[PDB]
Amino acid sequence: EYDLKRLRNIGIAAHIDAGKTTTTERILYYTGRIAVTTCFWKDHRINIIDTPGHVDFTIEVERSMRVLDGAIVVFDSSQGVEPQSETVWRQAEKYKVPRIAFANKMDKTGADLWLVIRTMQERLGARPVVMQLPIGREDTFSGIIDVLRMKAYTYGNDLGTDIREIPIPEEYLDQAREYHEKLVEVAADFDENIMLKYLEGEEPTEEELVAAIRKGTIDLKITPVFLGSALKNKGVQLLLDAVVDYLPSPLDIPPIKGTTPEGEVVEIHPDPNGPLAALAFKIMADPYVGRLTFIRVYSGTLTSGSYVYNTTKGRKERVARLLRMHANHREEVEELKAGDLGAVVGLKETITGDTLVGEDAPRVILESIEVPEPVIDVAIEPKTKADQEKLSQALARLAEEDPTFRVSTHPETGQTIISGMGELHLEIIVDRLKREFKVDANVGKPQVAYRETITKPVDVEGKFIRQTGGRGQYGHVKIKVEPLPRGSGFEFVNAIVGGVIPKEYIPAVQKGIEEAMQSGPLIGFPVVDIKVTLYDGSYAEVDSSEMAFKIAGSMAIKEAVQKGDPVILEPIMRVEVTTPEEYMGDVIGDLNARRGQILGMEPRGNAQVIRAFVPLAEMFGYATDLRSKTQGRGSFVMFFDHYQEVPKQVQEKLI
Ligand SMILES: Nc1nc2c(ncn2[C@@H]2O[C@H](COP(=O)(O)OP(=O)(O)O)[C@@H](O)[C@H]2O)c(=O)[nH]1
Numbered sequence: 001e002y003d004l005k006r007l008r009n010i011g012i013a014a015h016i017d018a019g020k021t022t023t024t025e026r027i028l029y030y031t032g033r034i035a036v037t038t039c040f041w042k043d044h045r046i047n048i049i050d051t052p053g054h055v056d057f058t059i060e061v062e063r064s065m066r067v068l069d070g071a072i073v074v075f076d077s078s079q080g081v082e083p084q085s086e087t088v089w090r091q092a093e094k095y096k097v098p099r100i101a102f103a104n105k106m107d108k109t110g111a112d113l114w115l116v117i118r119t120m121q122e123r124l125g126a127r128p129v130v131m132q133l134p135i136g137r138e139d140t141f142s143g144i145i146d147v148l149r150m151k152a153y154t155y156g157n158d159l160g161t162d163i164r165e166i167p168i169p170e171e172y173l174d175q176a177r178e179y180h181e182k183l184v185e186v187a188a189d190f191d192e193n194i195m196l197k198y199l200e201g202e203e204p205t206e207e208e209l210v211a212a213i214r215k216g217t218i219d220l221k222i223t224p225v226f227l228g229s230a231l232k233n234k235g236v237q238l239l240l241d242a243v244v245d246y247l248p249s250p251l252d253i254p255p256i257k258g259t260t261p262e263g264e265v266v267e268i269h270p271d272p273n274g275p276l277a278a279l280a281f282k283i284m285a286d287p288y289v290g291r292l293t294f295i296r297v298y299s300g301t302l303t304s305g306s307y308v309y310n311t312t313k314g315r316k317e318r319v320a321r322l323l324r325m326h327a328n329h330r331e332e333v334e335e336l337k338a339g340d341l342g343a344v345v346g347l348k349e350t351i352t353g354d355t356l357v358g359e360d361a362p363r364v365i366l367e368s369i370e371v372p373e374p375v376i377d378v379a380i381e382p383k384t385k386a387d388q389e390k391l392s393q394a395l396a397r398l399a400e401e402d403p404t405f406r407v408s409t410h411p412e413t414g415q416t417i418i419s420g421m422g423e424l425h426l427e428i429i430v431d432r433l434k435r436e437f438k439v440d441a442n443v444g445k446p447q448v449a450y451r452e453t454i455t456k457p458v459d460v461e462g463k464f465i466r467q468t469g470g471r472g473q474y475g476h477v478k479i480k481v482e483p484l485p486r487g488s489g490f491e492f493v494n495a496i497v498g499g500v501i502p503k504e505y506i507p508a509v510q511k512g513i514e515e516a517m518q519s520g521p522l523i524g525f526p527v528v529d530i531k532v533t534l535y536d537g538s539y540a541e542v543d544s545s546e547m548a549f550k551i552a553g554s555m556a557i558k559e560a561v562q563k564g565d566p567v568i569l570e571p572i573m574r575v576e577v578t579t580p581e582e583y584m585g586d587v588i589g590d591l592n593a594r595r596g597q598i599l600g601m602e603p604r605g606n607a608q609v610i611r612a613f614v615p616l617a618e619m620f621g622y623a624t625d626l627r628s629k630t631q632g633r634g635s636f637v638m639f640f641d642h643y644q645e646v647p648k649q650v651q652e653k654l655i
């Protein structure tokens with residue numbers, strides 16, 4: 001019942017509103033008549049990996065490219081290859097995943113198969129190949145002509161319940177032959193047996209044509225193009241056939257690659273009997289059974305009721321039950337092998353992105369272990385305590401499913417501060433909270449998580465001598481604070497020596513420092529990358545207390561940071577801007593205006609991918625300015641790289 005050769009992990013992707021959901025639903029319908037939904041067609045298992053809701057979900061998208069094997073790009077046949085279409089395309093190119101295209105909405109007014117073919121050629125340099133011609137134009141669209149097999153199909157209704165293989169109507173008869181000749185030509189580019197025949201004017205075997213087009217599609221050399229109307233149930237069954245005919249099995253594509261703890265890259269091969277290696281890519285919380293953590297098995301076998309090792313951490317996780325999600329029901333399975341996908345129940349310490357392995361297998365990691373330094377802060381204020389109550393709750397819960405964000409209570413304001421990887425991250429989170437959790441609050445505008453730090457050693461003291469509330473308080477500390485190498489964080493060294501400061505308070509003076517670091521002097525942002533050494537001070541036999549030293553520590557640090565030629569530190573993003581050749585130095589000047597630094601340009605497909613360093617504070621509304629200069633065709637990804645000292649000029653302003 002299992003056989004790689006007949007597995008087919010795909011993922012539908014299209015410009016928003018083009019027809020991804022409908023196309024997927026119609027697939028499940030047709031295959032159904034007998035995060036990752038499975039189904040069968042012509043003796044083949046199709047695992048429809050669920051691609052991110054929108055291309056902007058960059059991280060999610062790249063991960064889904066690695067989790068799927070083949071793709072079906074859906075275009076609105078009346079719009080052609082739109083901006084996002086281009087975006088997903090670049091993505092598909094980046095992960096070299098074979099693909100086929102589907103011209104959807106052929107039934108709609110303005111729908112044109114040639115607009116999709118031409119724009120695919122033009123914008124994407126896709127080298128499409130006409131796999132079929134339509135019958136009827138708009139509301140009169142009624143049939144599809146397979147031009148590889150020279151046969152037509154007409155549809156009795158808009159319900160996908162009356163399909164009839166009629167011969168090609170004389171009226172498109174010539175066009176079919178024209179494209180069939182053209183289709184044979186393309187196939188000859190991948191098979192000499194066919195090239196010979198083509199030249200001979202001979203007719204190659206369907207099995208021959210189908211295999212060469214497949215070879216080509218999987219070699220990233222061509223893109224079969226099919227058409228239809230998802231909503232009007234036309235062409236979907238023909239699309240299901242294309243999937244099996246031309247889309248790759250876990251054996252047709254190069255193996256996924258992973259890194260061992262030794263930093264050594266490795267090719268993980270799709271060997272069911274080899275050591276297990278799987279990726280968890282979507283942690284969902286199903287109503288009955290709790291959290292389903294979806295995984296892609298790359299090699300080896302995942303067994304039900306067993307132990308897998310989480311290399312992205314270091315503990316044995318327990319896979320309770322394994323299920324395959326079908327269109328209208330769940331199915332418990334005894335195991336999932338190489339090239340397959342499913343949802344494992346259990347696994348409480350495993351989060352999306354982690355790697356699970358054989359427990360007696362190499363400890364490879366399919367993804368980086370690094371963590372997204374929170375670079376965007378957004379304040380939230382529940383509106384009624386009742387909303388406040390279910391807010392921090394929704395957070396605790398949502399915090400486990402995704403730990404790439406941190407929450408804090410702003411020092412002075414006392415406000416709740418959610419921090420993420422970028423405006424978008426925070427956007428989906430915030431949204432998720434008002435919807436899934438129906439928590440309504442006032443959400444502040446996103447800002448960059450600046451940090452503060454000194455740039456020269458200082459030796460200061462903190463005294464807190466006061467008759468506070470009747471009794472006297474006395475705290476005296478003398479610390480030496482010096483700058484730590486960027487990224488070292490915090491270090492407290494207690495060099496105290498003669499009971500000079502009663503041990504009873506050492507931790508208390510640290511508590512004071514930790515708190516006065518929650519707000520630098522320049523802009524009241526966190527102080528980081530500093531070494532603090534308490535070496536002297538004094539106490540009052542009766543007047544001292546944990547509080548006096550606590551405050552004494554707070555004072556000492558405010559003093560130390562204000563005196564050490566403090567400097568503001570801003571996040572520096574690593575930006576990859578994929579753009580059409582034409583708008584080249586055009587986009588390069590903008591990034592330089594954003595105080596950027598280009599690191600080079602290495603082409604992708606028929607487009608140019610520019611790599612650069614740009615300060616996050618300069619990326620606000622970049623998505624817009626970009627499309628403003630790449631005439632809507634450009635796009636880009638962005639990641640945190642390092643923290644940097646803001647320029648002399650920049651500083652004087654932020655202050
Ligand atoms: N006329 C027509 N409408 C379609 C077709 N496919 C999808 N739609 C409609 O277009 C809208 C967006 O489609 P949907 O699949 O949700 O787009 P998605 O954002 O790509 O998932 C919905 O109103 C669909 O019913 C099609 O072939 N023809």
Ligand SMILES: [Mg+2]
Pocket residue numbers: 020021022
């Ligand atoms: Mg949708």
